[PDB]
Amino acid sequence: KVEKVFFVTSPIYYVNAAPHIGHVYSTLITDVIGRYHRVKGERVFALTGTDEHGQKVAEAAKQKQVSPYDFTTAVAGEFKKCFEQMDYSIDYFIRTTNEQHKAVVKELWTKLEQKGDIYLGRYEGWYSISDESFLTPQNITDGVDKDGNPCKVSLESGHVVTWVSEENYMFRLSAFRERLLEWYHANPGCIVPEFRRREVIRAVEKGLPDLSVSRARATLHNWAIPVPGNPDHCVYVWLDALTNYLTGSRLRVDESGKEVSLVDDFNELERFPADVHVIGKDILKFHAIYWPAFLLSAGLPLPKKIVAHGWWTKDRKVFDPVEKAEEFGYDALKYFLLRESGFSDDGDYSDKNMIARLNGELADTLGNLVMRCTSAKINVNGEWPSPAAYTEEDESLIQLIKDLPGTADHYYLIPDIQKAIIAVFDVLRAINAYVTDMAPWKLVKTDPERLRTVLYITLEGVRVTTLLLSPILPRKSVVIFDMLGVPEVHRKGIENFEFGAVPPGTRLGPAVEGEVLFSKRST
Ligand code: MET
Numbered sequence: 001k002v003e004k005v006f007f008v009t010s011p012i013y014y015v016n017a018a019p020h021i022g023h024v025y026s027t028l029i030t031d032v033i034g035r036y037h038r039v040k041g042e043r044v045f046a047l048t049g050t051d052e053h054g055q056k057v058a059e060a061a062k063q064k065q066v067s068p069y070d071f072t073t074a075v076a077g078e079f080k081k082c083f084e085q086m087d088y089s090i091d092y093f094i095r096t097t098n099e100q101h102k103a104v105v106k107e108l109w110t111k112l113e114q115k116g117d118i119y120l121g122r123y124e125g126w127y128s129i130s131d132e133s134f135l136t137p138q139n140i141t142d143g144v145d146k147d148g149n150p151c152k153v154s155l156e157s158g159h160v161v162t163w164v165s166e167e168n169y170m171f172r173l174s175a176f177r178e179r180l181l182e183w184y185h186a187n188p189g190c191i192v193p194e195f196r197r198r199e200v201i202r203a204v205e206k207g208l209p210d211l212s213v214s215r216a217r218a219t220l221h222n223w224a225i226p227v228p229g230n231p232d233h234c235v236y237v238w239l240d241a242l243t244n245y246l247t248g249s250r251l252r253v254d255e256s257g258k259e260v261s262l263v264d265d266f267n268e269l270e271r272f273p274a275d276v277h278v279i280g281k282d283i284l285k286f287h288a289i290y291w292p293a294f295l296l297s298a299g300l301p302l303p304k305k306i307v308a309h310g311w312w313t314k315d316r317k318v319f320d321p322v323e324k325a326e327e328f329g330y331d332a333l334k335y336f337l338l339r340e341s342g343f344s345d346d347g348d349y350s351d352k353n354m355i356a357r358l359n360g361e362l363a364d365t366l367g368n369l370v371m372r373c374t375s376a377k378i379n380v381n382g383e384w385p386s387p388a389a390y391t392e393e394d395e396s397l398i399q400l401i402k403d404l405p406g407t408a409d410h411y412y413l414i415p416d417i418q419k420a421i422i423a424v425f426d427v428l429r430a431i432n433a434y435v436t437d438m439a440p441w442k443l444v445k446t447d448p449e450r451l452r453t454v455l456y457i458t459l460e461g462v463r464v465t466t467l468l469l470s471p472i473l474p475r476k477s478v479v480i481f482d483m484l485g486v487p488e489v490h491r492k493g494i495e496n497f498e499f500g501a502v503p504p505g506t507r508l509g510p511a512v513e514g515e516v517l518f519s520k521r522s523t
Pocket of ligand 1: 014313
């Protein structure tokens with residue numbers, strides 16, 4: 001019960017290679033969640049960015065034979081170009097090379113050391129460079145390296161692992177087991193979906209070793225943040241990386257989305273801790289185990305929710321998001337990725353199924369419906385009519401429209417965007433059945449009063465559904481509201497989740513001779 005900036009993040013992505021889907025997916029989920037809270041009238045800060053340090057990224061820049069500084073800048077430019085083309089509404093793009101971020105990392109590091117949670121030790125064990133992840137012997141197995149020779153690989157990811165024996169600064173993660181366990185249990189929604197929350201607990205129950213938070217300077221090709229007070233060591237890319245969330249919460253951003261100052265105290269901008277960390281299933285441990293343990297050591301507040309979707313947010317496997325968005329449309333693609341993907345990789349991403357959902361749901365259910373209630377043939381006055389008396393059937397439909405907001409609200413807040421969309425379209429399917437059942441095209445001649453009632457209900461249903469769909473279909477929801485003639489003030493705010501927010505007499509927006517909202521793609 002504290003009014004605060006709703007702070008939602010994506011992961012920051014390794015810039016070892018171009019952006020692809022998945023990066024786009026993760027950022028989409030972050031964008032949608034942020035958008036939904038904006039239509040509720042809440043303050044929002046959506047964060048995304050790039051993870052530019054590390055052995056991975058340094059060695060990727062070597063293979064392209066160019067400077068780390070030049071390489072990280074260039075790939076990051078590609079991430080921004082991509083995210084702008086994607087038409088998101090993110091508030092800030094962060095980069096771990098940012099000088100103010102570096103400052104926050106060092107500040108955090110010192111905090112951890114002053115608390116006595118960092119000591120000089122050794123790590124002697126396996127490491128996946130591609131994952132920047134330490135692994136116990138039970139998490140590797142036999143495999144083949146890039147030359148076809150025998151080697152070891154992560155069971156997590158199948159990437160090549162190498163044995164590391166280094167004197168590192170070690171963090172006392174073992175000491176935080178009992179407090180994390182308390183945290184998971186006191187806050188049973190803090191990790192979503194449930195079966196990933198159960199995975200985290202089982203792992204932490206088993207026992208936690210201490211974590212290596214530094215590495216030898218040479219190993220990282222001097223591409224990392226120096227450990228404060230020890231120039232021989234660099235900060236573990238993951239500590240560095242996770243700290244972006246804290247950095248983001250402390251950056252004042254200007255008109256153009258550029259940082260202009262870093263604040264001393266996170267309370268100043270009221271963002272920290274994150275309300276939702278959006279992540280892929282591949283990085284759960286860093287966020288649900290390491291991250292909270294660091295925060296507990298530093299006396300910082302823990303995030304409210306971590307949601308981990310069913311995608312490998314990096315290095316999976318030809319599905320270009322821009323080329324698909326130019327083919328099928330931008331809101332349609334976003335709708336398709338959000339509708340087809342629950343909390344699994346079991347989704348069907350063929351063109352066949354993209355067309356089935358476009359035509360099936362977007363066109364026949366949403367599109368057809370929007371036309372009917374604006375059609376000059378049916379809505380002959382091009383206005384919102386005054387409803388007459390309601391039948392029990394009218395009420396049954398109206399009831400669905402009234403209950404829809406609270407239900408979609410809960411789903412968005414889980415967060416489960418698929419279930420929110422499904423819940424909206426269930427109401428859309430019902431409105432269409434109602435209209436088929438009522439044949440308003442016939443009512444124009446036979447019963448004008450009954451038409452008034454039918455058409456009003458259809459308009460409000462289309463408005464309320466379109467409102468709750470506006471985070472998924474941002475550009476199209478604007479086109480729909482324009483057709484319905486909905487004033488700007490009524491496109492936002494929980495006030496306008498209520499039935500009858502737009503008054504009768506409201507005039508529809510101007511039409512165009514060959515206009516179509518969602519265009520049917522031939523199979
Ligand atoms: C703190 S989020 C770091 C995520 C990592 N850079 C990745 O691409 O998976």
